[PDB]
Amino acid sequence: ADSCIQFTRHASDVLLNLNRLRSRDILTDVVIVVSREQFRAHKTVLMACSGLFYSIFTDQLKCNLSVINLDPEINPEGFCILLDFMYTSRLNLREGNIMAVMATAMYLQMEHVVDTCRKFIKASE
Amino acid sequence: ADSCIQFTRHASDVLLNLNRLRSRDILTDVVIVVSREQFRAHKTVLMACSGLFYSIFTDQLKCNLSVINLDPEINPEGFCILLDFMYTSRLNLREGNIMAVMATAMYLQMEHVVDTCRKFIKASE
């Protein structure tokens, strides 16, 4: 209908609870491997935040995998920062990690993150 | 860190994508049965929005069930309205459904919905 009321904080409260489930390893259904590092997550949150994971988990074979191995060129800290952003809306962007975060966001297909990385780099030129 | 930047629309964009996955029946992992009606959903979204589903899906046996049957006194339209609220932040509250929505929200343990129902009822007294 068009007569709905809306609870402003609902979406951010849902995301907070999804991150609490991730911290406690509750109903996590995939491990993402980035070289020597493993990250447990929920496939639905990954798909909802990344064009690459949306493609992977809508594929009729890959949707059933419990482990996904990323390209060896992907930096684990860059992936960790982006996984935290997926679950919190907060991006820990620093001079020492911006190149790795931007490269990881291009690979994961996260256009808003790629945008703010490009803007922060351009401001330092 | 404390030096994060934040993307304002991220949480609402995640919730929109979770609702699109639900509409397309992508990676839904539970069917909620409410008398004669069935509703497919993602356990993590249900837990993130409801004290009852949080208790059910953190139980070591019930976490593995693919079907959950609700109490026969629960109204299917009331449940449908609340499931749509879980996935959108929008509550279709009307004179003809408020009693069923409030009863369903009390059973599901959704305190903000119970609150606005009580306020709308009190305004009509």
Binding site: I5, Q6, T8 | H112
Partner: peptide, 5 residues
């Protein structure tokens, strides 16, 4: 919270 969206 609640608002008219």
């Amino acid at each position: 919270a609640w608002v008219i969206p």
